Design an enzyme around this catalytic site. Sequence first.
Site, mmCIF file in Angstrom:
data_model
loop_
_atom_site.group_PDB
_atom_site.id
_atom_site.type_symbol
_atom_site.label_atom_id
_atom_site.label_comp_id
_atom_site.label_asym_id
_atom_site.label_seq_id
_atom_site.Cartn_x
_atom_site.Cartn_y
_atom_site.Cartn_z
ATOM 1 N N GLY A 27 13.907 73.663 7.418
ATOM 2 C CA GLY A 27 13.211 73.530 8.318
ATOM 3 C C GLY A 27 11.995 72.302 8.837
ATOM 4 O O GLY A 27 12.088 71.909 7.538
ATOM 5 N N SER A 28 12.280 72.785 10.181
ATOM 6 C CA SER A 28 11.692 71.977 11.000
ATOM 7 C C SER A 28 10.978 72.166 12.235
ATOM 8 O O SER A 28 11.282 73.316 12.758
ATOM 9 C CB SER A 28 12.332 70.376 11.237
ATOM 10 O OG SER A 28 11.020 68.991 11.716
ATOM 11 N N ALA A 30 7.557 71.394 15.727
ATOM 12 C CA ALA A 30 7.113 70.198 15.973
ATOM 13 C C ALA A 30 5.945 69.743 15.302
ATOM 14 O O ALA A 30 5.314 68.820 15.248
ATOM 15 C CB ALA A 30 6.422 70.762 17.389
ATOM 16 N N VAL A 34 9.360 71.808 6.561
ATOM 17 C CA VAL A 34 9.248 73.438 5.626
ATOM 18 C C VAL A 34 9.902 72.830 4.471
ATOM 19 O O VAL A 34 11.445 72.316 5.015
ATOM 20 C CB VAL A 34 9.216 74.641 6.579
ATOM 21 C CG1 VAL A 34 8.599 75.539 5.226
ATOM 22 C CG2 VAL A 34 8.760 74.506 7.940
ATOM 23 N N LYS A 49 4.630 73.982 4.606
ATOM 24 C CA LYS A 49 4.873 73.325 5.349
ATOM 25 C C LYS A 49 3.496 72.202 5.556
ATOM 26 O O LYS A 49 2.809 72.106 4.612
ATOM 27 C CB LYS A 49 4.730 74.374 6.260
ATOM 28 C CG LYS A 49 4.449 73.789 8.257
ATOM 29 C CD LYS A 49 3.540 74.751 9.311
ATOM 30 C CE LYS A 49 4.574 75.875 9.730
ATOM 31 N NZ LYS A 49 3.664 76.656 10.429
ATOM 32 N N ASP A 145 3.625 83.857 22.430
ATOM 33 C CA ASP A 145 4.761 82.865 21.789
ATOM 34 C C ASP A 145 6.088 83.506 21.222
ATOM 35 O O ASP A 145 6.588 82.793 20.641
ATOM 36 C CB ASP A 145 4.091 81.782 21.412
ATOM 37 C CG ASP A 145 5.321 80.134 21.302
ATOM 38 O OD1 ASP A 145 4.936 79.650 22.608
ATOM 39 O OD2 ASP A 145 5.994 79.306 20.641
#
Length: 347
Positions: A27-28, A30, A34, A49, A145
Amino acid sequence: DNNFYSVEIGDSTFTVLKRYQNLKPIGSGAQGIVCAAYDAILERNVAIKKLSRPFQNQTHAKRAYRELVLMKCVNHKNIIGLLNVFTPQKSLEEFQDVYIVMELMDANLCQVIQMELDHERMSYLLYQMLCGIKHLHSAGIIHRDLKPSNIVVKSDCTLKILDFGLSFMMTVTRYYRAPEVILGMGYKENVDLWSVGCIMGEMVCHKILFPGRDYIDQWNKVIEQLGTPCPEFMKKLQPTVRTYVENRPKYAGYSFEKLFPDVLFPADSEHNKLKASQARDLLSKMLVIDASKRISVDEALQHPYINVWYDPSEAEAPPPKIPDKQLDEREHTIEEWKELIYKEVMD
Ligand SMILES: NC(=O)Nc1cc(-c2ccccc2)sc1C(N)=O
């Protein structure tokens, strides 16, 4: 180095400790990319990360600093634990990247949302989310969040919250934002229960409940499903907001029976029919526009749908000790953040 090696992960360079092998992008964000990796020392898979120049702007910096501090002082089964932290850079002057090593989980909730879940798994995932949130609250942390992409799951149904939640930066949490965040009215601890309601609703119906293209549309999506809020709510709004909200088309909303019918749940047996009714009642107490009338984390944890799993060692765990006003988010320069972060990394 003699302790480090470099592998190309797309257009990015991962310079990691030799103990971490077979890096794979999972994954990615901002913040950065990762990778899943194998830790040869612990003999287990990890997630690494990479935070590229985290001190680059105050938004990235505050987030990186909060992540590092909170991950080092929190030890709860429903909050992602810190296994390691390093930088390949030899000094403050050369200091560029921060690498955070965490336990590797099998999936994120976006993937779970695309599955029909039996009530035992659904209620156990929800219980864990609430434990993790309750633990954050007990230390004075309001997440604000929470979204499916920041919640991870393992094969045995164990659940972990990935971040601590928290301005302008260059290059989709809005769907899970509570009316009080949308309408800029300030918030209490139960701002997080709205997000759980959004996530739970999505776990039941398999689609984003309130997919607003912006904050104005977001409000419209909320009111279409739930209805125009009470006048008692309107009076809590600042005049400029109170005027905007009162001048919107009026909506009666839908009962939770129409929003979440038995067709969306396991409801064959008598056991499942009862659980579907209990799950509906919980959804109805979370997805409440007026935060003063919305369920708290403790009432949610003690709700019939959830309470079958209640364990005080998980739900009433001693709060983490955050070393004071360290996360007050006072403005710092690029170089001040660079130093604060470096010091947290080196210890
Ligand atoms: N499977 C999966 O999504 N794992 C996962 C994904 C993470 C992630 C974090 C930020 C951005 C993109 C992906 S962290 C993590 C973990 N610790 O297991």
